[PDB]
Amino acid sequence: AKSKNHTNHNQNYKDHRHPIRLKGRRNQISSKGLEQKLKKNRKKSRKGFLTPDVQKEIREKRSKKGEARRLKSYEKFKAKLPIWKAKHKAA
Amino acid sequence: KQYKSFGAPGVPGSHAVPKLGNRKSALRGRRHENARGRRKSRAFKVKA
Amino acid sequence: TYRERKNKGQHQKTRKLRGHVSHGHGRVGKHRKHASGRGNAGGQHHHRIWMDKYHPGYFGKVGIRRFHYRLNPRFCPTTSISRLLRLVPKEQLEACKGKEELPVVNLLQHGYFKLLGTGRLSQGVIVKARSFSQGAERKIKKAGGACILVA
Amino acid sequence: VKKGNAPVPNAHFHKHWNPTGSQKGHVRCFFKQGPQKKIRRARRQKKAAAVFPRPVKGPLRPIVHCKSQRFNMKTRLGRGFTTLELKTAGLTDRRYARTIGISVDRRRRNHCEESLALNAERIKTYLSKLVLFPLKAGKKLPEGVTEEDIKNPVQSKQDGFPKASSYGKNALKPEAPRKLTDQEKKRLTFQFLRKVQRDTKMVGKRIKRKAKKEAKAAK
RNA sequence: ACCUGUUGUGGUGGAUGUCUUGGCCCAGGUUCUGAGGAAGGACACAGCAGCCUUGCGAUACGUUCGGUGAUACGCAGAUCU
RNA sequence: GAGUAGAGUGGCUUGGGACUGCAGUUUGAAGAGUGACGUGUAUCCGUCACAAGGUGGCAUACAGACCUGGGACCGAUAGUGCACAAGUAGAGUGAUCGAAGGAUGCAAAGAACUCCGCGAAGAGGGUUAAAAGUCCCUGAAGCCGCAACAGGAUCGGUGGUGUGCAGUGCUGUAU
RNA sequence: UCCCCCAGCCUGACCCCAGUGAGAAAUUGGCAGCAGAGCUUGGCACGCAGUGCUGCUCUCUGCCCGUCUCGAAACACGGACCAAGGAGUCUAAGGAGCUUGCCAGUCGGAUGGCUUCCAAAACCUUGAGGCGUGGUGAAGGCAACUAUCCUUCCAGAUGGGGCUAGUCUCUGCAUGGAACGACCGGACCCGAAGUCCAGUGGACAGGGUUUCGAGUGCUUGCAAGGUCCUUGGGACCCGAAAGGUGG
RNA sequence: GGCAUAGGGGUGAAAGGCCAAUCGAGCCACCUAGUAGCUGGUUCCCUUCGAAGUUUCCCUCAGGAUAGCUGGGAUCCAAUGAUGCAA
RNA sequence: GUGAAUGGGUGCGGACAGGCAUGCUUCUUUGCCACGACAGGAGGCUGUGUAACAGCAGUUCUCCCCGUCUUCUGAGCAUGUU
RNA sequence: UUGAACAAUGGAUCCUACGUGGACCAUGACUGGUAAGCAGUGCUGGUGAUGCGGGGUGCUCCGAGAGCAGACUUACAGAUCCCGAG
RNA sequence: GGCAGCCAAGGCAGAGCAUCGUUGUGUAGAAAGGGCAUGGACAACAGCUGAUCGUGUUGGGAUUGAUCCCGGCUUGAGGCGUUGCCCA
RNA sequence: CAAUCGUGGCCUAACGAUCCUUUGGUCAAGUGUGCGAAUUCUGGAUAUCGAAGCCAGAGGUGUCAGAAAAAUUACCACAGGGAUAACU
Predict the structure, then answer these.
(1) What element of type H or E holds A41?
(2) Which residue's alpha carbon is at the shortest distance from the C1' of G204?
(3) Alpha carbons D134 and D145: distance in angstroms, whole number
(4) Of A34, A36, C47, C59, which one has the fewest beta carbons inside 10 Å?
């Protein structure tokens, strides 16, 4: 006739039978909802992306830029090195 | 054709093919299961 | 094996439930005839959740209704450009490769009315059909062949 | 109703289809199929033995193209030849045609010359494969009949001619490779289709346009 | 002596096993009644017969004729090779 | 091919939806055409057919009843209500309702004769492979009689447990 | 709290000398080279050992089952006894696994060819067509880019080539997630510039979107059987008070 | 004694009385095995796994659908000791 | 106005961590030229090993300084390196 | 110092047939009520679904959890006798 | 799960064989876990049966169990069983 | 001035499915000082005739996830219920 309606008794037990986990934790989340300016900019950036070979030779050129200075100064230092070693001997 | 139906169509985000037993409508506008919960005209449309 | 040795039983679960009083339907909630309705009863009241969850677009009316819907004048099986050169005896496909002649593909012979333009084409062929997409026309024309409207 | 995802039942068995004690039922079980196959075969060969020295089917039927756009290319058998096909073949008497075993259909006409020619040559290969027996067994004897065609009347099972469908299954046979034609190079078939479909839709508009043009011409 | 039991045996009882001139089912064919009297219902009819008979009607378990060819039968009784 | 087709309206019917078909009623054509062309109407055009009369075989249906062939069917509480003197006995004023009921034996060889008794029986003695004895293939359980043996106050029970004691089998068994 | 002097306590490793010792395992059906846990005694018919059964006795126990219920031994329901009967079945459609065959096909026993009963079987591909190969739009309708190959990214099954018990590159299936500068159809916005012609001025075309699809991105299909089920059916079996038609 | 009035009907000095031991709608056959969210029953053994009386919506409160718990089938990987000696 | 106990969310690293160089963008910025031009000096410096720092190796070395030329915005996404 | 401890045969991806959806008990966490073997709640565990040892008896207390046996030892709790243990 | 040191065993690859380890309650419910059992079809047992079928009854043995096998007696056939699989 | 702020009420209540109807839009027309840019009524067309369609509102279900709804029975009945009163 008159029931005992609401109860939260066995609910933690049922809820803990299997581990309480998030379904997708490593999965990426959709880009839908991300700000429109950032989405458009990601699209256009990726469009403009250069290729790995062009990037490799670009980085090579950047490394070669300051080479005449670096190699010269380094060889000068390497020449002055043995004098330093022979002075450090006298200690 | 089973994997496509796995899940529930009436769950937002799940794009499950509704289970249609042998009923392939000829008028694709007056199709089966395409009105209430399939167009926002009919008070709501299942979310994508 | 041993599993194959068991080609037994005809109503396995029913004959297994012999000796158990409720016959697999419970003591508390009996197996009683039609405890929820007959057929799709209650689609909007007590099976509202079920209908909403498993059959959304039920319960409504949409679209132009067409009295005396003829379907023979709407029958139009479609094929694609990817499935054309299979329909040419490759002797023709070989003797026409670089040369100017193009083999003729009559789609009605195989049962296709329209030609859809998905799939690349290797060499130009002449395609007779009852309709073409503009993609199919574009691909055939660029490959070298021609589309032909045929009754 | 299922506690699952199964489709909506749509069962259609609400009206006493079941032969129970109270009902007679709406059930017909075709257990006679096996025996009736043999019975049909037996009565068919009894028909042959009855109308023996004649085709077992018996009337030459014409070949007509199936009706709709879906079955345009499929040919099949008709009910009888048109009187134009008869007159072209050489028969001007429908009742005599019928008595010698050519079927007539005055309801049919030839909407084209192809059907006329096809069924005319059909009747003409008939009436040459045909050996008429003479009435009263010893009077006049027609041409071609060699006095032992009457000694050896053979009842063929199918009527000499190829299958009915083998007349559309020959028109549906492409040609050999060919050169393109410059109209086949310039022609835009999709543009043509869209044009001839927009044509039937722009009719009243292509009248209001003229009306406006001539009103502005007046003004 | 009475009770309880276990055997043996005897009764009451008709379960079992096996079968079946019966049913049920499927397929094929026919559908062939009647005012010239139908379908049904009565009352009759047998040496010993009450019932039953898709027996029969005062010619009444039967009449003519054909096919068969020595029985029929629960008793008798004269016909029959 | 005229109270017709159609139309207003009412009612049934149909998937037929500004009405598929039918019917009443009011109305009621054309025939220098008409009907249908699945959205009511008006205007043009086209296709098909020729209603308001009639015949008309074939392929088709066939749970009854008769003539047949079959069956992964039932096997006397089953299969038809009926395997049988079953639509019977019986019940009801009646409309109607409606059962139970199969099996001797190879062969009736169906139990001669004797004793006892009024007689049925019974005791002998027979038929028969056998009483299988017109209750007749077999004859279960429940229940009952009798004899033998074992016990007998106590939910201190039925049943379980571990021994014992009597009765009773079974298995193995060295030199 | 750190340092110095004098000393000292406990203890590790190593160098030297003496003494002392050589470590685990080794039948597990048997044979194999070793290794190897069993043996003795007394008794028993031609009785002994063991084991059941029935009854009785003794120790410890022992409520009456089925059911509904939080709760039954219940003063809650059914239950005197025995026998025989007795209740999840078939069908149309369908779902998700599993099995089998074929494959962009598959099935085709409506029907057709054959051959005393069996045989209404078996066999045959004459087979329309069913399902699938394309989806999207209310509809008018339209219809999935890519010319050496190949959508991208993260994780990832195999495999290759170097290399090294440190360990680098290439491949990247399946699955899950994200993306798409991709494309098909629908809906928006700015436009309709541009190219073209089966030319009644019509056909597409461009750039943008917080856009939708049961979309595509190397077609995941068909048929049969089987299992568990669903819905209509008497529908697991029995069960109303009722309603109707005719007498 | 004869005859007449019949079931939603008859008849009644009215009690809803009476109409074949039947009456606030007789009986008889059929629809009909009516429907029942309700009560009762649901037939062999062993092994293994094993709950819920809670959520939401419902003319819903003795019932359902919906999550949850409960069984099974899996798929992609992962993880997974054990030489008596002698030869 | 304070505020426990018991509680709740998150984080606790690769051998994917962390660092470094570079690219792209229509987004952001005043922040572009520039994926450009130019450029000196000091130095027992740097690393492994050590409280004795001895010793050993030299790799486009260390510092002024990730310099100057008006002096070089971030973010997101990638390419390489360790 | 592979940069907290402990544990871990586990993580990911799914499909699918059911039963259940009357609950009840215990505790300064409580609310209504004078109160109730009352009514309604919270955390957790039990009963239901669970037998076994003890509480004489008792669905819920205390111990402990249940394959068939043998030996040893104990939990709760016990030792006048009933009744094993002074 | 033969390409094995040899015999013995096993030898049906979801089987079997050897060793080791873990774990054993259960209502509703389930098992693509395993079996007992009944009627009949298709097959196998050159199966049994008048030197006595089947039923039944009484003892015995096997089995965790569903149940299986046998002896005695009744009884006498108008018979029965074991295995695979299929239809209930 | 600008940064900004502003798509209702400082914030936490103040409200409503299918089907139907209605209005607006689509369409159609109009503009278009030259071009376009389009839903349907199926035998082909026309018609600011009519109807249908799609899109956005509105007309309401307050029992507010939304049936269309008065009593009585002491003449009563059925399926149940100790889920639930009257007696112990």
Answers:
(1) helix A36-48
(2) D191
(3) 10
(4) A36
CA atoms of A26 and A41, how far apart (whole Å):
25
Angstroms from B1 CA to nearest CA on chain C: 16
**Residues of A from 24 to 63 whose C-beta is within 7 A of strand I: which are they?**
37-38, 40-42, 44-50, 52, 55-56, 58-59, 61-63
Q: Of D54, D112, D107, nearest to D78 (Cα)?
A: D107
CA D60/CA D139 separation, integer angstroms: 27
User: What angle do helix axes D189-201 and C134-143 make, rounded to 10 degrees?
Assistant: 150
- Residue D50 CA and nucleotide G239 C1' are separated, in Å, by 66
- C and D touch with 3+ CB pairs <8 Å, answer yes
CA C151 vs. chain centroid, Å, equals 26
What does DSSP assign to residue B4? T
DSSP-assigned beta bridge partners for residue D63: D77
Elucidation technique: cryo-EM
Question: Whose CA is closest to D80, among D25, D119, D40, D127?
Answer: D119
State both tokens at A75.
């060889």
DSSP labels, C36-67: S-SSSTTTTTTSHHHHHHH-TB-S---S---S
- By residue count, chain D amounts to 219
Query: Which member of D5, D8, D10 has the closest CB to residue B8?
Result: D5
